[PDB]
């Protein structure tokens, strides 16, 4: 997860008098909308597929390189897509690895990440 080392060292102070006000406007975004596409888009289409790439480009890869400019920065996106995502399912992480996102973001983030 994003632990000590990450999250309290970088999130709290790119947070601080910075993501305070900003990360809390992102992360519940990027997960309510995100999440808001999968619930209509997945019971509409592939977008659940779409939801990967983007999330962990747009606001993953936004908020953690601010708020978890470590590990889950670049070991979720590229450490991940490679088997993590695939070696999870040979689908192509269209489901288990990608939906993960948020029982993964909320649980860990809820706890040190407002």
């Not at 995100?34 to 999330?55: A, F, N, R």
């Not at 070991?75 to 897509?81: E, G, T, V």
């Amino acid at each position: 997860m994003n632990t000590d080392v990450l999250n309290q060292q970088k999130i709290e102070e790119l947070s601080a008098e910075i993501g305070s006000d900003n990360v809390p406007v992102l992360l519940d975004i990027f997960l309510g909308e995100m999440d808001s596409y999968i619930g209509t888009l997945t019971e509409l289409q592939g977008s659940e597929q779409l939801l990967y790439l983007k999330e962990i480009s747009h606001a993953l890869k936004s908020s953690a390189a601010s708020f978890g400019a470590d590990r889950l920065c670049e070991r979720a996106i590229a450490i991940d897509k490679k088997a993590k995502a695939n070696q999870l399912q040979e689908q192509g992480m269209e489901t288990s690895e990608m939906l993960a996102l948020l029982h993964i973001t909320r649980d860990a983030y809820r706890s040190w990440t407002n």
